[PDB]
Design a binder for this molecule. Structure first.
Ligand SMILES: Oc1cnnc(S)n1
Ligand SMILES: Oc1cnnc(S)n1
Length: 158
């Protein structure tokens, strides 16, 4: 069902994350981690303390798709096991819990606009662009359900 998903997304904040390659999204899906540039690290740390859930919606540059979405489970932290990001600065590491590892083509989100980016289609935005609550909620509900994920453990972290 979609009820636990809606519960996780209640009053959440949403951020568009743009990866330059598929390899970095693969690492994030395998290890439950993300790292970003300092400007966005600051925004995400501020958001993590401000909201019951912070959702990252991932899109690989030039792919024409989103590759899934995940919820921050921590603020960024330095040290830890090194992540071999295939780079084209990546300071702290956020731990993330994946909510959906399935893709969504941009053609399916054409009816959603982001008020925080001039009401342009939600696929449009720089890395770190915040997505308004209603737009982000509907975008997440468009993804195919990911039956491999159990949101019970995520709900307990809120
Ligand atoms: O492709 C990637 C991987 N990790 N951080 C960033 S900003 N981009
Ligand atoms: O939580 C973390 C931090 N750093 N590396 C890994 S693999 N996980």
């Amino acid at each position: 069902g979609t009820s636990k998903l809606k519960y996780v997304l209640q009053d959440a904040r949403f951020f568009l994350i743009k990866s330059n390659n598929h390899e970095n999204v693969s690492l994030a899906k395998a290890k439950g981690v993300w790292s970003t540039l300092p400007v966005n690290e600051k925004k995400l740390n501020l958001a993590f303390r401000s909201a019951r859930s912070v959702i990252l919606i991932f899109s690989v540059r030039e792919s024409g798709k989103f590759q899934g979405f995940a919820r921050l489970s921590s603020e960024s932290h330095h040290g830890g096991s090194p992540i071999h990001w295939v780079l084209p600065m990546l300071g702290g590491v956020f731990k993330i819990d994946w909510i959906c590892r399935r893709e969504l083509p941009f053609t399916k989100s054409a009816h959603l606009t982001n008020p925080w980016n001039e009401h342009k289609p939600v696929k449009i935005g720089r890395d770190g662009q915040e997505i308004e609550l209603e737009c982000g909620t509907q975008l997440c509900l468009l993804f195919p359900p990911d039956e491999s994920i159990d949101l019970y453990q995520v709900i307990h972290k809120m």
